[PDB]
C-alpha cells in the first residue's frame, strides 16, 4: 500500500481515520478550535491528558486513540523556542502513530489557530508536520476549515511528488 497525504476541509471530530490528533493545551482542559470539537465528541479522552508543551499523550476511548499534541503558544514562546517546540510536538505525534500501529491518522495544523500569536503559520506548521510524518507509513489526513488554506495545503502536498 502507498502511504498518502490528503487534506479535508471539515470538522476533524467527524474524521473517518483510525485515530485523531487534538491541538491540545498542556493542562488537558477543554478549549476553542480543534479541542472544542474533540472535547464535544470524546470528553473521556481528557482523563489524564495533561502533558508538557512539545509532547503528545495518547488516551484510548475504547479502541480509538486520541493523541493530545501540545503545540507552543507563540504569544508566550519566542519564534526560535516556539519553532523547536512545534517540531517536537509533531515528532511525538509521529512516534505515537508508529507505536499505536494505526493505518491512518486525522491531524490539524498545530499552533495555527489559538496558539498562532496572530501570525499566518500554515507553511511553518505544515513543514513541521511533513518533517515528522514523512518517515511514518500511516495515511495522513490533514483537517482544516478555511477554503484558501485547503487549496494551499493541497498544492503543498501535490508539489512534493
Ligand atoms: N474542528 C476543527 N476541524 C478542523 N480544523 C479546525 C477545527 N477547529 C479549528 N481548526 C483549525 O485547525 C487549526 C488549529 O487551530 P487550534 O485548534 O486553535 O490549535 P492551536 O493553534 O494549536 O491552539 C491550541 C489551543 O487551542 C485551544 O482550542 C486548545 O485548548 C489549545 O489550548 C487552525 O488552522 C484552525 O483554524
Residue numbers in the entry: 1 to 161
Relevant lines from the article:
Recent work has demonstrated that CHIKV nsP3 macrodomain (nsP3MD) possesses mono(ADP-ribose) (MAR) hydrolase activity, which specifically removes the MAR moiety from aspartate and glutamate residues but not from lysine residues in substrate proteins. These results suggest that the nsP3 macrodomain is critical for CHIKV replication and may be a pharmaceutical target for anti-CHIKV drug discovery.
For this purpose, ADP-ribose was used to optimize the protocol since the high-resolution co-crystal structure of nsP3MD-ADP-ribose was determined prior to the attempt of co-crystallization with a fragment. Native nsP3MD crystals were soaked with ADP-ribose in three different cryo-protectant buffers (cryo-buffers): (i) a cryo-buffer containing glycerol and iso-propanol (26% PEG400, 0.1M sodium citrate, pH5.6, 10% 2-propanol, 25% glycerol), (ii) a cryo-buffer containing glycerol but no isopropanol (26% PEG400, 0.1M sodium citrate, pH 5.6, 25% glycerol), and (iii) a cryo-buffer without glycerol and iso-propanol (42% PEG400, 0.1M sodium citrate, pH5.6). The crystals were directly frozen in the liquid nitrogen for X-ray diffraction data collection. In the structure, residues D10, G32, V33 and R144 are responsible for the specific recognition of adenine nucleobase. The main chain NH groups of residues S110, G112, and Y114 are involved in the phosphate binding via hydrogen bonds. Residues Y114, D31 and N24 make hydrogen bonds with the OH group on the distal ribose. Notably, most residue contacts with ADP-ribose are highly conserved within the alphavirus family.
